[PDB]
Design a protein around this ligand. Structure first.
Ligand SMILES: CS(=O)(=O)N1CCC(O)CC1
Length: 182
């Protein structure tokens, strides 16, 4: 409907796949080459389904900060025959607050879904499902089951992936450029 939805659409149409694990279907952001991200609670194993194709997992790393605290981001390298468009230049370098974000989801349950979530707070610490978690972004939208893995963007920046909510607020794990240096 406007330039925020324009940027979100451009990321969804080229840099997302539908990931299925034994814990369900997730929006999965591809970042560069065969490297993607997914919430750590998806519990990635040795085999994952990508757009309903059986795919070997070459590597999966659940990220933690240097306090050894959960970040709720898993970086997955896929044995896929095709590379993602490199979007690492759209990743923020530091922790920040944002205005006017969009949360975008694409699954069997929620295809082509875009949510204007408004102001994004650098929330920091969250007890997420009983797990202490750092680098959490918060937005005042009542997000629902089916939205985990959703991509959070502003105009020109890919800032996080949706990892939970409390019925009134939604929570994303930050994406930082430093997670994807090769
Ligand atoms: C899905 S959840 O309940 O928000 N939660 C995610 C983090 C994990 O460590 C515990 C479970």
């Amino acid at each position: 409907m406007g330039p925020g939805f324009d940027f979100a659409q451009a990321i969804m149409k080229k840099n997302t796949v539908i990931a299925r694990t034994e814990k369900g279907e997730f929006t999965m952001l591809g970042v560069y080459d065969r490297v993607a991200v997914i919430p750590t609670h998806a519990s990635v194993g040795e085999i994952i389904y990508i757009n309903d194709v059986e795919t070997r997992v070459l590597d999966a790393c659940a990220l933690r900060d240097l306090t050894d605290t959960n970040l709720e981001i898993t970086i997955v390298k896929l044995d896929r025959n095709q590379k993602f468009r490199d979007i690492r230049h759209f990743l923020p370098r530091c922790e920040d607050d944002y205005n006017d974000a969009v949360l975008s989801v694409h699954t069997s349950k929620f295809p082509n879904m875009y949510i204007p979530v408004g102001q994004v707070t650098n929330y920091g610490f969250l007890n997420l499902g009983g797990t202490p978690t750092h680098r959490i972004l918060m937005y005042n939208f009542p997000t629902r089951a089916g939205q985990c893995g959703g991509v959070v963007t502003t105009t020109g920046k890919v800032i996080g992936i949706h990892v939970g909510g409390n019925g009134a607020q939604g929570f994303a794990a930050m994406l930082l450029h430093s997670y994807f240096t090769d």
